Design a protein around this ligand. Structure first.
Ligand SMILES: [Zn+2]
Lengths: 83, 47, 286, 83, 83, 83, 83, 83, 83, 83, 83, 83, 47
């Protein structure tokens, strides 16, 4: 049972780390263009912020699923039951 | 199998390649060389 | 005969070298050929390279000997086109008046092109012809000289020797060692510049050494991969199946049509790199 | 069953991850240009949003396939049944 | 035989995850320029959409091959019969 | 349980390292764009700084989650209790 | 024997996944630049398409070799014969 | 505790190396834009330097805790206290 | 001996996959810039194409060395001969 | 012990290699923008050079720590005494 | 000695594959800027070509060392014989 | 012992390959920007070359240490003595 | 694969071929081209 538990811990580590890396890089890329646009058109900032939040909803869609799955693995490990 | 099949396959492929070359690659080179010769001839005639 | 044995036989060179009983004899097996030390010769590579070089030199000597200085003939027009192309290439890269650079570039380009060209013939033609002529069925014979790392290494080492010779000739051993140990980073005071000589050497010697290695390996990898893929496709014909052979013909045709471009491009790259390397040995770039 | 389940955990982790990573990076790249376009011509936003959603579907297709297969590997197991 | 199936699971995970990551990043890169062109030249959007679909046809080919091979491995494992 | 511990160390190392890498790259991108905007329009710096902080929170959310999970694994290892 | 087959499965997955990832990213870059050129010069699209196809011929050269080798490994097997 | 210490060495290596790579990439990206801004107009260099330091404070936040816990693993190992 | 063959398979897989990935990304970059150049100056297209082929001659060297060595490793084996 | 020293070798390799990779890429990114700025205004070059050095220090701050830790591991291995 | 040879195969594969990937990406980056320079100022082409060929000697210096040492490992394995 | 030298081979491969990849990418970026600067202003080439070498030294700094350590490991293995 | 003295034979043949080309191929062709260009220039300066 040690192998299963160790590999599920590694799985949780991968699941959270890859999502964190992707989210950080993607949000840096998005925020740079948001700052450039805000500097270009100060009067359109209220709309640009809403559009940035709309895009941010799509950016974190799969990352939150991964984080939830990692939490479910670490607190309610289903692999211990041989499934 | 093995010998007498590989030779036939290679010969067929090489013949197809040679036909492709003789129909598409050679005429442009020949034309370019002849154009160079004709331009040299025109220059010499002008001289 | 198995496909693996077919490939293994196609991967071996005709070797002449020191047998245990004397410095004379040809190897009959791969193990016997590898048993010979550094003092061995690949007969097939040297023979093909010398033959193609002699043919090229003879053809170019025929046109040069009877240069008309008027309306050119069919052959000498082609020779003039090649010479004009090489001269234009040299003029745009090298600004000195060294007479060695242009004939060297022409020889390198045409020789390497001719060595690469023989890869387009079917793989089993020349080895089987040699086996039948010599009467030995298990005869090692590889035609393409540029798929042997020895040939590319010899070309690159000779180019490197020319680089070193011309650098020494135009700068003295003085300027040569100065450019190798002092030039990229310099200091007004002795104590700092002494700490800088190891960095300068570590930065310059590596780049100097990497030139012949890259020159040899860039050509060797491309030619070796091309010939190996040509050999592998021939095995598809050996299966005797209708479906596999039909695909093999298309694959071989596509590979040859793609390979002619590689054949031209590798020779052009080798010529241009040789010209660039020789030109940077007469000047200062750091 | 130890090895197969332990490696299935890693497989689920590697299916949800790299998918979260690609989705986050791709959506950052897409949203940056969407904000740049909305800040250059502020009146083309309604069309740009629809085009962005059209591109986002193609962006997320394979990631959703991977997430579905990972869920199938988590709450079912085609590998355990193969002994 | 546990090793063969366990490594087949990881092979499928890699086949799908790498393809998903690649397609997500590539489609982000493509859609960014598509949105930029649409915002700068709004009258040319119907042609740009067709060209983007043509490019997306080339973009997603090898990923489709990979996902087909992964499904073939999951449901018709050929490696089990080779031992 | 000698294998489970140590694999938890590898897990926390991945959790923190991937988050640090992603955070550093994302903040490099965001700060570069912010510096460009400030250098072109020095009067807009006060608003751009606030917008940069707003983006930074979303950038660092998941990385902070990962760091918390890694600390929890380091000091209150839950996989040990699962035998 | 089992190890050889298990490792060849992972080898096939590596070949196809890496080829797919590289092809997707490269075609994303090429298609983005092609769309930029098409939006810039709408009358030059027919020639730019031919140039893009010429480039795509070079882009997939090694990937197709890898895919062919992977299929050869997954259907036939040169390593099992070596024992 | 041979395996525990052997894996702790790898954990420390990952913690330091990934953070070093991330900080190097991020600081290259930030410094490039800082130099570009300094070159665009040198009269604003003192403010740009302070802003760059502010951004660098955020960029290096997670890496310093990563190296801190890496040193905490090298000296006074916490995982060998767990058998 | 089985370990040697199994690891040779993975060596071939890496040697071809990494080269394919690099070649695809590099050719994507080169072809994209070539398309931009062709779009800017239509009269310079043939010279740009010749220069692109010249650069492609340098781009594809080490990948071809790796491909040749991998094909050598598949149908011949210098490692098996060392027992 | 064999395994701990073998893993310490891999740890040193990672510590130096990741730092070298990050340093090379980040320094290339910094040097490119430094050359562009020097080309823009040749008269301000010394200021650009000193500002490049003060950010090169930040770039290499963590890489030098990594290489120091690796050299400490190589000659004064602290993990072999923890057994 | 089996493990030594097997790991030497992987070492050679890494040594060549990483160098191939790096050189392909670097030469794509260099060639793209060379083509852009040749398109913007067509009169500078020969100088740009010679400068690119000079930089190509720095680009692959370490890669050539890696390929040479990998070829040394394949046929003149030094690790075998060290017990 | 075989394991120590087998892991030392992998360590050397990592040390050289990561440095090669980093140097290739960094020099590609630096040379591309240097070529762009030379194309924009041919009169500035003599000083741009000097600055390019100044930054190339910083590029190769850490990778030279890496390759030196790799050679020291290959010919003067310090880990075998540790037993 | 197998490093031999072919590395030396190839360099010897290379140097021999380059020395042949430097003296017996390039000068006559270059001289003929230059003489033809001079003839063309003189014919264009006849005015
Ligand atoms: Zn110098």
């Amino acid at each position: 049972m040690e192998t299963v538990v160790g590999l599920t811990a590694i799985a949780v580590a991968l699941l959270i780390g890859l999502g964190a890396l992707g989210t950080a890089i993607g949000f840096g890329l998005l925020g740079g263009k948001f700052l450039e646009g805000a500097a270009r058109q100060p009067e359109m900032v209220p709309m640009l912020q809403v559009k940035m939040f709309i895009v941010a909803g799509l950016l974190d869609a799969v990352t939150m699923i991964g984080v939830g799955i990692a939490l479910f693995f670490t607190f309610a490990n289903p692999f211990v039951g041989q499934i | 199998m093995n010998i007498n099949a590989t030779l036939i396959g290679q010969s067929v492929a090489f013949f197809i390649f040679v036909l492709f070359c003789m129909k598409f690659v050679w005429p442009p080179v020949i034309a370019a060389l002849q154009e160079r010769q004709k331009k040299i001839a025109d220059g010499l005639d002008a001289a | 005969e198995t496909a693996s044995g077919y490939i293994q036989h196609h991967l071996q060179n005709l070797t002449f070298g020191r047998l245990p009983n004397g410095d004379w004899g040809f190897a009959h097996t791969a193990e016997q050929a590898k048993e010979m030390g550094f003092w061995a010769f690949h007969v097939d590579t040297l023979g093909w390279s010398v033959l193609l070089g002699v043919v090229f030199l003879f053809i170019f000597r025929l046109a040069a000997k009877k240069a008309t200085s008027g309306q050119p003939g069919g052959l000498q027009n082609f020779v003039e086109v090649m010479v004009e192309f090489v001269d234009t290439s040299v003029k745009d890269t090298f600004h000195g008046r060294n007479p060695l650079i242009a004939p060297l570039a022409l020889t390198v380009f045409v020789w390497i092109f001719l060595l690469n060209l023989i890869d387009l013939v079917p793989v089993d033609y020349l080895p089987m012809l040699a086996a039948k002529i010599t009467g030995d069925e298990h005869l090692f014979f590889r035609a393409v000289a540029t798929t042997d790392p020895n040939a590319t290494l010899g070309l690159s080492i000779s180019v490197f020797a020319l680089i070193v010779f011309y650098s020494i000739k135009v700068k003295g051993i003085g300027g040569f060692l100065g450019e190798l140990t002092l030039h990229p980073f310099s200091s007004k005071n002795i104590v700092v510049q002494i700490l800088l000589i190891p960095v300068n050497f570590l930065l310059e010697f590596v780049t100097l050494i990497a030139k012949p290695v890259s020159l040899a390996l860039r050509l060797f990898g491309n030619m070796y991969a091309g010939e190996l893929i040509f050999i592998l496709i021939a095995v598809m014909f050996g299966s005797g199946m209708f479906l596999l052979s039909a695909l093999g013909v298309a694959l071989n045709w596509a590979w040859a049509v793609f390979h002619i471009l590689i054949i031209t491009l590798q020779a052009f790259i080798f010529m241009m790199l040789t010209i660039v390397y020789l030109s940077m040995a007469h000047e200062d770039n750091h």
